[PDB]
Amino acid sequence: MNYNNKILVSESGLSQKHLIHGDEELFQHELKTIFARNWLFLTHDSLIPAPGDYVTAKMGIDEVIVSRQNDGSIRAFLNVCRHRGKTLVSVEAGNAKGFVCSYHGWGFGSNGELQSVPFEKDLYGESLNKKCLGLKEVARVESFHGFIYGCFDQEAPPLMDYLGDAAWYLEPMFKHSGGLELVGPPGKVVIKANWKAPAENFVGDAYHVGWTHASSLRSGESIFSSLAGNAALPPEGAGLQMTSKYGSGMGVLWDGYSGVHSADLVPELMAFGGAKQERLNKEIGDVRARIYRSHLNCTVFPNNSMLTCSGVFKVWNPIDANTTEVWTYAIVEKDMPEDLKRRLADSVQRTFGPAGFWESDDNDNMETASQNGKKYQSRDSDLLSNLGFGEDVYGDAVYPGVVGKSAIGETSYRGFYRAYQAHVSSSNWAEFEHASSTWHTELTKT
Amino acid sequence: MNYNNKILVSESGLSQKHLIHGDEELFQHELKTIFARNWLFLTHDSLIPAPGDYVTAKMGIDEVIVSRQNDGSIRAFLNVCRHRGKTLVSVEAGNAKGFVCSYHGWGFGSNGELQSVPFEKDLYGESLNKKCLGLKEVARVESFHGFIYGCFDQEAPPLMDYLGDAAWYLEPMFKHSGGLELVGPPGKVVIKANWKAPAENFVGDAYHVGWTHASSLRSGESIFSSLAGNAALPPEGAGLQMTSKYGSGMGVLWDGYSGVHSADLVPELMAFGGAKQERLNKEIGDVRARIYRSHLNCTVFPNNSMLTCSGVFKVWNPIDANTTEVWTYAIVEKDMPEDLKRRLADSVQRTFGPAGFWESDDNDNMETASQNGKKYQSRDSDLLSNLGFGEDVYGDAVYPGVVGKSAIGETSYRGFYRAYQAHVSSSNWAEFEHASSTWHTELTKT
Amino acid sequence: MNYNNKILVSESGLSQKHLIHGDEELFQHELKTIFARNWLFLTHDSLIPAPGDYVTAKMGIDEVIVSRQNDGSIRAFLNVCRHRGKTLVSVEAGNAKGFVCSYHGWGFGSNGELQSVPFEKDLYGESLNKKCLGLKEVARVESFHGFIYGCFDQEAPPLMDYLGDAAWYLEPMFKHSGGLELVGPPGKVVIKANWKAPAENFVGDAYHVGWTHASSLRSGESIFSSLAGNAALPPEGAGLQMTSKYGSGMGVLWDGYSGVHSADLVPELMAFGGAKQERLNKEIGDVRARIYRSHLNCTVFPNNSMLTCSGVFKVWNPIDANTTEVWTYAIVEKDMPEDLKRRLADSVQRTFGPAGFWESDDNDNMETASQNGKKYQSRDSDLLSNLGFGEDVYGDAVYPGVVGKSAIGETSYRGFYRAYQAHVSSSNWAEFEHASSTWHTELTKT
Amino acid sequence: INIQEDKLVSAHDAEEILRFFNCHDSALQQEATTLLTQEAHLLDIQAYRAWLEHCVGSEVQYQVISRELRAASERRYKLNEAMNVYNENFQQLKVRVEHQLDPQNWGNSPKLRFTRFITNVQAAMDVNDKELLHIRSNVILHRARRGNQVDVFYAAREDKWKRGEGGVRKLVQRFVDYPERILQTHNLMVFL
Amino acid sequence: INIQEDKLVSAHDAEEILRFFNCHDSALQQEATTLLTQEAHLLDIQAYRAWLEHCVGSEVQYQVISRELRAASERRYKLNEAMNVYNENFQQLKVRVEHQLDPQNWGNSPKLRFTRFITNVQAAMDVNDKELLHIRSNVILHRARRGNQVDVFYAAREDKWKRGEGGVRKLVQRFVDYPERILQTHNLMVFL
Amino acid sequence: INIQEDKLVSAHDAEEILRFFNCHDSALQQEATTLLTQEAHLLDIQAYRAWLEHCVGSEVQYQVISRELRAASERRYKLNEAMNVYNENFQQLKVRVEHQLDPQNWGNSPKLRFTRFITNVQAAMDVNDKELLHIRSNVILHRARRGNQVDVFYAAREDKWKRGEGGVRKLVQRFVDYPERILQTHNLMVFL
Ligand SMILES: NC(=O)c1ccccc1
Ligand SMILES: NC(=O)c1ccccc1
Ligand SMILES: NC(=O)c1ccccc1
Ligand code: FES
Ligand code: FES
Ligand code: FES
Ligand SMILES: [Fe+3]
Ligand SMILES: [Fe+3]
Ligand SMILES: [Fe+3]
């Protein structure tokens, strides 16, 4: 397949070829044009707070070690020994001044430097240039209010700019709330779906909630529960959708601070969020204080998703075209009482973790949609994302980005796939920028 | 590999490259030139007799829904939602007026039409062209005496013509017997063989029976039992072999009406078939009435096989070059007493079903022959099908098709692979016809 | 990938691209340029001593039958029927005058000839040319002191010449000791590593022993035990390393006759080897008699490895780029007391067999190093083998080959990969020879 | 069990629960455990004739079905719900036993290896036939052959056992509803 | 057990050993076996309401954890060691039961098939609460659905059971430390 | 069993049947079940020193073989039929135990997880050595490590146990003929 020419996503992001969820050659191409190029979620300050603390993380199919340096910065390195290529670290988290390879005992510092080689003097003499044998370092590591992302491509936009118009919506909860903590360790489960299936679902799919999650809505008693079995369409102006230049997008459901949490947490959460909102009106204004306590279903392009307020934080780690390793953390507000944080974390896993009853509702949807992309008669068929097209705006006086002023639609699908197609057909960031110079115009046509 | 030029099957079908049972690129090419082009077995009238009845079936690696329409016709559709591509139907059989997708709730009629979309007015307004969003329909669906086949290629010959000279042999049992019923549900088992290995075996392999099935012949006491351990060669004129233009072929074993059935069913069957034969002499003549009660081992090209009289009906559903999903039904004559039908169905599964002791004898043969096609030193080696070559005839006054007038030979292998090579090297039906304009001459050379 | 041009191994064998352990296209290319071209271990005289005795063996991914002929020679044949390609022999060892196919009953002699075809006269008449239907024969089969190797390429050097300078080191134990026996049957285990990972480890890796095998050295009490946890570097001149034109190489650890064997066998072995050495001084000289009772860690290119004295004999049978089937035999000296042979064989399996505690130490090293070769950021990274470079010699007055006069280094890695690169980039033996005309000069540069 | 409340429970399954929850006889559970362990031992060593002689009653029905996948809400489609993978009388079992023992059963060379794990044994006497013992048990069956073929089967077995010749308890009915619809074990040519 | 000598043994595991190695009551082991076999039967036939009614105490904590992989020699990093796959009280179990039984649970059509294998049962009365029974058992759980999906779960269960309404023994605590860190079963939506 | 009639049965297997079909002692089966369940518990928590101390006799032979695949009709080829995956005396087991516990056993970090399922227990006293207990049992052993590595082992075990120090019953022989010829579990570095 010629990725320069092949139309995998139609103009305005209106449709995508079904093969994108199944084609292994395209998966391999994504490793280069998506995962080696873009910002990927690594960890949170709360998981590596002290010097020497480290975790392992995936970046695409590569594994990295993410380490807190003595100076308070964070650096990340390929989890691969520079000698004969053995995996250096076999655990998920810990604290250490360095890492010793179990094959021939080469010792690397927390700063990636080759610090010791067994019997170096007797064996290599002065001939080993350890200075050039440090671990292969992730070129870019940056923080968004404690959330740490990495990028293998030195040419990438800074993380703040990459978030584009999505950052404005995230800030009330990520910044003005006083800050969030990530509660680990994550649940980890493999699903037989393409990474794009859950990514697209979280970025912009409210349409599925009432039908897919009918049983969870009916059984759990959460605040979104009127939707069960498509019994009720949300009121006018119940929310909006947005998308951005570099692919990130989200839905906003006004006031839905208790999110998917069962009735056992609803009154406490609605009290807590409302109280903080009242304080925030004065500092960031009524609209943004309201956004703070509104449910956001977001994907940070390409494969990190979240539900704020519900507190669900996901990484869709790619394995192959029909295999994805799902990591699930809980996010909580730092100033919440500790007992509430504990119960919120448990409730995140109860609903969206490895035995998450909500998350289970989505399984067959993601898996079969992905696997059907391999089937001969479906490869060249068109997946539709046209709901709401022709009603999106850009440059609104109140809400930034390409925005659909309706709770349910496919605005965010279109922006996600516009960015995806621009990357798949480009050789570097400059070419992506050239391919994106009219991004919002394309999305708001008609 | 260049499929226009590569000789995978030698002239006259005398040999085939062993790689054809192992090469995954060729498997992918077969999805286009074999499975998307030819007639494939779907179901029987007896399994979907009433309006609204449906089953799911495979066509190559694609899955389809096969539905009885209100007007009595049958239509078939890809089992894939037109929205975001989720698998629509998760069951094997049922009765319904339509199918609702569990992702976003789109509702399709039994006629494939998009009939309802949740909240269409509020969401899409009048902008959704449901008329163009019906399920992707199988272009051609036709019946041979109740047996329903489908074809994705509108340009295919009608099913009757596609059966060619094989139809004459099938008619006494399929038509003049009063009609057959398919007894479901089928057994379903995965074997690690290429779909062509059992297809070729059923189309034309009597040579293997005495040796491969020695233990089953000795243990079961069926009428073909003299063959056990190659103890006895069938008498002269014990049967014949035939093949046809479009690849279908079969062996005929004269008078073998009780087939593989153990001695517990032999006298009853031999009485029943003989009695019907006596009535049929008057209507269709002695030769054809005899064919009715003669055992036919047949493949309807490419991947549907059967043993008439034994009542075994097989679909060799392709998964990859060394994986095949085997579906096994029983066929019975409609006018048989119900208790005999029940016992016959059980006996079909006893011998050829998931725990079929006969079918188990074939396992290692099919699996290792297929897997050896991946082995480096065997890929370019030649599988032989020359037995009987130079003794076949065409245009015989009594028996139509290319015919080997002997019970044991490889006539039907040659016709099967001649048609296979003509398809693999052709881009469409017109090219197959051009490649087949001297089909019988090629088969009867020397 | 263009294998004529792609530099997979840098000049002097100093580094290799990590993709060589993970790339499936390269694996397929190795089947042609490595496994179909070179000498591969089959069996030992001791396992097929009598006429009619046979074993099955792998040669690359192909399986062969290896049979003792009536005249005392050994011939080997593809384990694939010449009719429809079924696997002929399903057992690992036995005694027979021939092999009958379980599909249609064709009978082949122990000499590969098609000797019988069921009902040949009645079916084929005189038309079957059985003379041209013998099993596909391995072109070359030769012995090194009872150890039988095969090669599919008629153009290969004789096995003695192929061993090159490595033969000199093997002869004291393989020849002058009175001869070795292989004790079967082998242990068989699948590991998720590339075949090159254990091959390179056995050919030239002493550096890993102290660290990788720290726990086994500490726990087992063998004579190499001072090395545990890198507690002690071997004394000066404790050994050497060598490599050869066609890729075979080894390490020599002086006097280490009891090898990896636990203290329960040390005194008996050290007595036995010392006593034979004393007799050998007179016949082959002091240096070579000492080599006899010195521990050799050797790979016979490409995928047969051994530890003499320890008595470990390995075949790394390739399955795919990250799968290898490991066969483990014990080697013993024929004139050892039978009870010692029995205990030595058990100790070989105890340390290096399927539950070998030493072999288990290597698992993660081999598997992760191999699997990391598939990871995007590591494919184009460089595995290092520069230890000792610039200190190797060729043409030494006492020790032949390219020789590193130190116990620990990477001399043998360099020779192994020099030969590998020369084969991967060559179409036949003549081209390998042309690519190798300055082999030792390349290895001894600087 | 009220199956109008426990919506996922079949009428058949609810009846079988009722059988075991009532009278509990500890000694009977132990007899049943012995019976099944000995049966499994005979099968594992491929003593198929001994199995017939010692474990299987002359009036046996040995049945394993495969049920077609249908909608949970299905009420109209009423064609054959299942097919019989096995539905054997004693003579039919004997045929299968002879097929296993035949020296030209090429698939049995080299010899197969079987290992059976029997768990969750429950036993209750029949209410009406005081000589009929109902035994329920679950089996994991591991079959290994030819170096690298491994197939693992999983099933629940509903048995009836009755004293026959010599007072020996023998199998008069086994029923298994096989839980996997599409077999991924090459075949089901094992005695569950 | 001395965990300073048996270096690989956790303090928690050593304490649980001690519980069962002391007093052995054969009758109690048999009661425990019956209790667990009946519980597994109810779960296998998807009688989830019956399971709650008959097997689960009102004060239950039903907990399955997943422990982060850490270095054996780790002594400094002290953040949350595990997450809760399950950590349910009775009402939370009821929510999950209603979710299973809901007729719009699309994933339950066609009906799933469960087969549970319970082994290695040990039982001991609590030293201080003479009405509290500790039961340990291991489970293999086979879940099959939709033709060719098969998931097999493996776990050890640390239970406490206590007599409640009507003198019926009911589960008041189940603890499982799930042995596989990354699930390869699509989800853990089964009751271990 | 007549192995001339039951053609697939080995002489060894026929002799082991005979051992258990004769005298049945229900109490002995229960003792054997306790012994094996406790042994499995110690192994599962990696209390390998405790296992040696409490479960393994000083005179033990601990043997697991792998048998070469040969023709069922083979009568002439008479070379070594099997190799020893394990053939350990007490000191050799101790070496393996120390290897597991060594802090530089890098493969044991992060800590492995073991779960054992013991079934099909049979026990009989020896006819001649009234102090020797024969115990047969089957094991499924699940080993999980490093996020996504899972290996499952299946075997039948022929044991002899004898009262030693303090009257504690200890293992004096274990024999396993491993059923899979080519291991697909990376290694067999587990105590079956
Ligand atoms: N896409 C989602 O999971 C979602 C959940 C809750 C509300 C809105 C969207
Ligand atoms: N190919 C067959 O299965 C066959 C069976 C029975 C008779 C003839 C052929
Ligand atoms: N490479 C090895 O396994 C080795 C073992 C022992 C001594 C030297 C090398
Ligand atoms: S591979 Fe890491 S030190 Fe050699
Ligand atoms: S995928 Fe079917 S309704 Fe959306
Ligand atoms: S395949 Fe061997 S005789 Fe036909
Ligand atoms: Fe959802
Ligand atoms: Fe056959
Ligand atoms: Fe090693």
Side-chain angles (χ1 to χ4, degrees), chain B residues 103-400:
Chain B
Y103 201 165
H104 314 84
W106 285 22
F108 299 87
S110 295
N111 62 3
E113 289 184 353
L114 180 53
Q115 289 179 340
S116 64
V117 160
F119 308 116
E120 187 187 356
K121 178 63 137 300
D122 283 291
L123 294 178
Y124 292 93
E126 307 283 330
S127 80
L128 193 63
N129 196 74
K130 301 194 295 301
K131 230 176 60 260
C132 298
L133 290 174
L135 300 175
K136 178 167 180 173
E137 182 169 9
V138 177
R140 306 283 299 281
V141 176
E142 288 179 17
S143 177
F144 181 73
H145 309 290
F147 293 76
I148 311 305
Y149 291 77
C151 184
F152 285 120
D153 191 336
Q154 175 66 45
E155 296 178 340
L159 172 65
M160 232 338 230
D161 299 292
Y162 177 85
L163 292 172
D165 290 304
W168 184 86
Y169 297 82
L170 295 177
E171 283 176 337
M173 175 67 71
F174 277 68
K175 178 179 184 179
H176 302 295
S177 70
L180 309 180
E181 286 164 336
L182 198 66
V183 183
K188 298 188 178 186
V189 190
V190 179
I191 62 176
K192 294 300 289 184
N194 190 271
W195 65 270
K196 295 185 293 295
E200 73 178 30
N201 177 279
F202 276 64
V203 82
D205 202 314
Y207 196 12
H208 85 290
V209 174
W211 199 243
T212 288
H213 297 292
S215 58
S216 299
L217 290 163
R218 192 138 52 229
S219 302
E221 257 73 311
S222 55
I223 52 171
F224 302 156
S225 174
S226 52
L227 308 185
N230 283 344
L233 191 65
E236 173 49 30
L240 61 300
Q241 310 152 64
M242 65 78 58
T243 187
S244 66
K245 180 175 170 198
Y246 298 98
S248 294
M250 74 190 77
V252 180
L253 198 60
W254 289 116
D255 300 326
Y257 185 80
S258 64
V260 308
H261 299 296
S262 292
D264 49 24
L265 276 156
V266 171
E268 184 173 9
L269 290 176
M270 294 294 279
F272 186 90
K276 190 179 291 184
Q277 172 183 19
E278 188 79 4
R279 297 196 303 274
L280 290 172
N281 288 332
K282 308 167 49 158
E283 269 77 17
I284 64 178
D286 297 350
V287 174
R288 303 193 79 196
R290 192 179 191 189
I291 287 171
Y292 148 76
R293 52 78 44 81
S294 297
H295 197 263
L296 309 175
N297 57 288
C298 172
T299 294
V300 174
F301 191 95
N303 69 330
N304 169 217
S305 299
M306 71 194 71
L307 306 180
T308 67
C309 303
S310 285
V312 175
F313 201 80
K314 294 282 188 175
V315 187
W316 319 108
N317 278 315
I319 299 297
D320 58 44
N322 278 182
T323 313
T324 294
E325 184 178 305
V326 178
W327 292 20
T328 306
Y329 301 83
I331 39 186
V332 300
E333 289 167 59
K334 296 172 165 295
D335 62 12
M336 287 184 159
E338 293 300 312
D339 190 75
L340 181 55
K341 290 181 187 176
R342 182 186 57 76
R343 285 152 52 233
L344 195 63
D346 277 357
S347 185
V348 164
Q349 302 295 350
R350 180 169 299 117
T351 53
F352 278 86
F357 63 91
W358 289 65
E359 175 102 339
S360 77
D361 300 332
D362 290 294
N363 277 176
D364 296 318
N365 294 336
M366 335 245 60
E367 295 188 337
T368 66
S370 297
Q371 294 168 29
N372 284 336
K374 291 188 175 289
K375 289 185 167 56
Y376 183 82
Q377 295 289 334
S378 293
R379 293 173 193 168
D380 187 48
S381 294
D382 303 303
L383 303 171
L384 303 185
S385 48
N386 62 335
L387 175 56
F389 181 70
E391 304 298 326
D392 293 320
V393 298
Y394 175 76
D396 185 78
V398 181
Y399 307 102

Side-chain angles (χ1 to χ4, degrees), chain C residues 77-130:
Chain C
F77 306 93
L78 280 196
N79 189 13
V80 179
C81 186
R82 289 294 314 273
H83 181 220
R84 308 285 315 155
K86 200 229 165 222
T87 293
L88 195 58
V89 172
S90 61
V91 300
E92 286 171 326
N95 178 275
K97 282 184 301 193
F99 317 100
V100 176
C101 183
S102 65
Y103 201 165
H104 314 84
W106 285 22
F108 299 87
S110 295
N111 62 3
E113 289 184 353
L114 180 53
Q115 289 179 340
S116 64
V117 160
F119 308 116
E120 187 187 356
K121 178 63 137 300
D122 283 291
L123 294 178
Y124 292 93
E126 307 283 330
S127 80
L128 193 63
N129 196 74
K130 301 194 295 301

Side-chain angles (χ1 to χ4, degrees), chain A residues 46-49 53-55 90-97 183-192 210-216 218-220 228-229 262 264 325 327-328 342 345-346 349-351 353-358 360-361 363-364 367-368 371, chain E residues 61 63 66-89 91-109 143 145-146 148-149 180-190:
Chain A
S46 64
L47 299 180
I48 50 166
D53 286 351
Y54 66 92
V55 289
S90 61
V91 300
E92 286 171 326
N95 178 275
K97 282 184 301 193
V183 183
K188 298 188 178 186
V189 190
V190 179
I191 62 176
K192 294 300 289 184
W211 199 243
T212 288
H213 297 292
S215 58
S216 299
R218 192 138 52 229
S219 302
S262 292
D264 49 24
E325 184 178 305
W327 292 20
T328 306
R342 182 186 57 76
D346 277 357
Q349 302 295 350
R350 180 169 299 117
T351 53
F357 63 91
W358 289 65
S360 77
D361 300 332
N363 277 176
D364 296 318
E367 295 188 337
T368 66
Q371 294 168 29
Chain E
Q61 170 178 28
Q63 182 177 33
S66 183
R67 190 179 298 275
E68 189 159 61
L69 303 179
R70 308 257 172 101
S73 64
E74 182 70 57
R75 30 42 247 148
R76 291 176 223 102
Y77 192 77
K78 296 183 175 75
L79 295 175
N80 300 125
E81 284 169 359
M83 51 78 61
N84 285 314
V85 177
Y86 284 95
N87 183 22
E88 310 303 84
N89 57 32
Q91 184 47 237
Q92 287 158 347
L93 291 176
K94 186 137 188 55
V95 166
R96 289 177 175 278
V97 166
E98 298 289 2
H99 175 256
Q100 285 305 303
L101 269 60
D102 188 287
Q104 293 180 320
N105 185 328
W106 316 118
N108 281 349
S109 178
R143 179 183 67 191
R145 66 189 293 263
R146 293 195 182 190
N148 59 14
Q149 189 181 332
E180 303 177 35
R181 175 67 179 121
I182 303 168
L183 299 193
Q184 326 263 298
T185 48
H186 307 263
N187 59 51
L188 233 175
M189 287 283 288
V190 300

Side-chain angles (χ1 to χ4, degrees), chain F residues 32 48-50 85 92 94 97 99 116 138 150 167 179 182 189:
Chain F
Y48 295 122
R49 291 205 199 284
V85 177
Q92 287 158 347
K94 186 137 188 55
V97 166
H99 175 256
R116 280 166 176 82
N138 296 346
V150 180
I182 303 168
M189 287 283 288

Side-chain angles (χ1 to χ4, degrees), chain A residues 19 28 61 73 92-93 102 109 220 272 284 287 308 329 337 364 376 386 415 422 425 438:
Chain A
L19 69 93
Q28 294 293 318
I61 64 168
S73 64
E92 286 171 326
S102 65
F272 186 90
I284 64 178
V287 174
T308 67
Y329 301 83
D364 296 318
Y376 183 82
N386 62 335
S425 67
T438 58

